[PDB]
Amino acid sequence: PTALAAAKARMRELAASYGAGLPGRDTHSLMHGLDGITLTFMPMGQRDGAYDPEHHVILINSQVRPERQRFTLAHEISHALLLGDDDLLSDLHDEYEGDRLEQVIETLCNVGAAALLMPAELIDDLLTRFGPTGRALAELARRADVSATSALYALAERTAPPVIYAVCALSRAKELTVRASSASAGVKYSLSAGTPVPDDHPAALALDTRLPLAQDSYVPFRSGRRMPAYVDAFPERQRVLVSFALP
Numbered sequence: 169p170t171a172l173a174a175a176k177a178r179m180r181e182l183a184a185s186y187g188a189g190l191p192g193r194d195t196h197s198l199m200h201g202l203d204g205i206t207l208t209f210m211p212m213g214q215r216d217g218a219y220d221p222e223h224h225v226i227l228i229n230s231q232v233r234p235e236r237q238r239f240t241l242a243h244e245i246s247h248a249l250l251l252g253d254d255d256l257l258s259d260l261h262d263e264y265e266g267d268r269l270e271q272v273i274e275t276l277c278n279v280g281a282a283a284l285l286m287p288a289e290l291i292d293d294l295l296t297r298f299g300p301t302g303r304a305l306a307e308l309a310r311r312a313d314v315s316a317t318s319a320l321y322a323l324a325e326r327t328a329p330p331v332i333y334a335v336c337a338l339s340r341a342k343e344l345t346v347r348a349s350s351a352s353a354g355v356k357y358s359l360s361a362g363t364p365v366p367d368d369h370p371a372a373l374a375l376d377t378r379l380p381l382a383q384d385s386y387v388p389f390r391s392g393r394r395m396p397a398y399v400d401a402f403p404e405r406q407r408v409l410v411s412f413a414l415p
Contacts, residue, residue: 171263172272178256179276182249183283193285193296193312195238198245202226205248207223219244221251235315239281256396286322287311300352301329301400302409303380317348318409332387332412334359341367341376355414363390374401375408387412
């Protein structure tokens with residue numbers, strides 16, 4: 169495939185080895201894989217974290233929320249993994265340079281973080297037990313301790329059937345707003361952020377009543393187009409996680 173795709177595959181492999189060598193993907197456990205590399209939590213203003221290879225240390229901004237710290241850490245770990253791999257690093261140079269190379273490496277580090285926080289096996293186990301549903305999305309976010317959007321993209325990327333995933337919050341039976349969305353492999357239909365969700369829609373229903381719903385419904389495209397699909401909404405603390413199964 170493309171150079172950026174081969175690099176991603178490789179990054180997913182690096183992250184999987186390091187990950188598979190741990191006792192789970194909890195924070196403290198990710199730290200422990202650090203084979204003689206210092207790790208420090210300290211205030212760093214607006215910067216989230218940094219990796220200093222010469223000093224063999226990873227720095228995490230102690231001022232940000234724990235969710236982003238866990239992420240920033242998976243990210244710097246990826247960064248170290250990438251910089252430790254000479255075949256990968258060289259092929260990148262063969263294809264990029266200057267700021268274009270920095271941005272690509274930043275992108276790979278994000279792909280690596282994800283693979284590390286959300287292993288292919290944990291996602292598949294959830295797809296099996298819960299199906300491609302709001303319920304699964306909700307499980308993955310909690311068990312993985314990552315944001316809804318991280319889970320949204322992880323989940324959709326390993327989904328076989330055509331499905332739309334959405335995270336909704338109160339725009340405030342009250343009307344929601346799509347915050348983030350994502351489609352599986354072959355769906356081209358996208359549900360954009362900003363998209364209002366009607367009160368009568370199962371997603372609004374589930375939230376305002378804190379009751380997992382599931383039933384035949386429609387994708388509420390902001391165009392007015394009402395595409396039928398099976399909907400599974402899993403309501404929680406102020407968000408609702410939804411899947412739209414397209415025939």
